[PDB]
From a paper:
Ngb is over-expressed in hypoxic conditions and it may be involved in gas/redox sensing, radical scavenging, and/or signal transduction. Notably, hexacoordination in Ngb accounts for a peculiar structural rearrangement and complex kinetics upon ligand binding, which takes place when the distal histidine (His(E7)64), engaged in internal iron hexacoordination, dissociates from the heme. The dissociation of His64 is the rate-limiting step for ligand binding and it triggers a repositioning of the heme which slides further inside a large internal cavity. In this study, we spectroscopically and structurally characterized three Ngb mutants aiming at pinpointing key features: a CD loop mutant with enhanced flexibility (Gly-loop), the F106A mutant and the double Gly-loop/F106A mutant.
Crystal structures of unliganded hexacoordinated F106A (1.8 Å) and carbomonoxy-F106A (F106A-CO, 1.75 Å), were determined to observe the effect of removal of the steric barrier to heme sliding posed by Phe106. At this resolution, we clearly detect the double heme conformation: the B conformer (canonical, 30% in ferric F106A, 27% in F106A-CO) and the A one (reversed, 70% in ferric F106A, 73% in F106A-CO). As compared to WT Ngb, the structural difference between the two conformers is larger, likely due to the wider heme cavity, created by the Phe to Ala substitution that allows conformer B to adopt a deeper position within the pocket. We also observed double conformations for proximal and distal histidines. The geometry of the His64-Fe-His96 bond, for both conformers, appears to be different with respect to WT Ngb and it might contribute to reactivity with ligands. However, the most striking observation about heme conformations is the relative position of the A and B conformers, that are laterally and vertically shifted, with their iron atoms being about 1.0 Å and 0.90 Å apart, respectively in the unliganded and in the carbomonoxy form. Consistently, Phe(CD1)42, a conserved residue involved in the heme packing through π-π stacking interactions, adopts a double conformation in a 70:30 proportion (lateral displacement of 1.0 Å at the level of Phe42 Cζ, not shown) in the structure of unliganded F106A. The effect of the double heme insertion observed in Ngb is enhanced by the increased size of the large Ngb internal cavity created by the F106A mutation, which results in a set of alternate conformations of proximal side residues that account for the enhanced biphasic behaviour in ligand binding of mutants carrying this substitution.
Residue numbers in the entry: 4 to 149
C-alpha cells in the first residue's frame, strides 16, 4: 500500500530529476556544509555551495543519485535485489570520505525535497513510507562501511 505511495510520489519528481536533485543538494549543503569538500573534481575544492551547481561533474552526480533512488522505487517490494549494488556503493562513498553519520542528513534532505515538491500531497504516511525506504537503502549501504 505504502509501496504505491512511494511510486505515486516519485512520479512527480522523477520527471525532472536534476531540478529536484538540485533542491536535495542545496538543502544538504545548507544543513551540513562540511560535505562540500568531498566533491573533488579536477583536484579542486568548491568554495561555496553555489560553486557546485556550476560544475558538470557535480550535476552529473545529482543525476546518479536520482537514478539510484529510482532503482529503489522500482524495487520497493524487492530490495534484497539491490543489496550487493548498495553495499558496494557504500564502500565507494567510504572511500571518497563520506561518514556513515552523514547518511541521515542526506535522508532529511530527500524528505525535504519531497515535502517541498508534493506540498499538500506529502501526507504523514508518505513521509513514513519514504523514511522506511531510505532507511532500508542506508542499511544496505552501511554493510559497505565494514
Ligand atoms: C553526502 C552525500 C554524498 C556525497 C558527498 C557523494 C559524493 C560522491 C562522490 C564524490 C562520487 C564520485 C564522483 C562522481 O561520480 O561524481 C559519488 C559517486 C556516486 N554517487 Fe554519491 N555522494 C553522496 C550521496 C549519494 C547518494 C545518496 C547516492 C544514491 C542514492 C549517490 C549515488 C552515487 C553514484 C551512483 C555514484 C557513482 C559511483 C561509482 O560507481 O563509481 N550518492 N558520490
Amino acid at each position: 500500500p505504502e509501496s504505491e505511495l512511494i511510486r505515486q510520489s516519485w512520479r512527480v519528481v522523477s520527471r525532472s530529476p536534476l531540478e529536484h536533485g538540485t533542491v536535495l543538494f542545496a538543502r544538504l549543503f545548507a544543513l551540513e556544509p562540511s560535505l562540500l569538500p568531498l566533491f573533488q573534481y579536477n583536484g579542486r575544492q568548491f568554495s561555496s555551495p553555489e560553486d557546485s551547481l556550476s560544475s558538470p561533474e557535480f550535476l552529473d552526480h545529482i543525476r546518479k543519485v536520482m537514478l539510484v533512488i529510482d532503482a529503489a522505487v522500482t524495487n520497493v517490494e524487492d530490495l534484497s535485489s539491490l543489496e550487493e549494488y548498495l553495499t558496494s556503493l557504500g564502500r565507494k562513498h567510504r572511500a571518497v570520505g563520506v561518514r556513515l553519520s552523514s547518511a541521515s542528513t542526506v535522508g532529511e534532505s530527500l524528505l525535504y525535497m519531497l515535502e517541498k515538491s508534493l506540498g499538500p500531497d506529502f501526507t504523514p504516511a508518505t513521509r513514513t513510507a519514504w523514511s522506511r525506504l531510505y532507511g532500508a537503502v542506508v542499511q544496505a549501504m552501511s554493510r559497505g562501511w565494514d
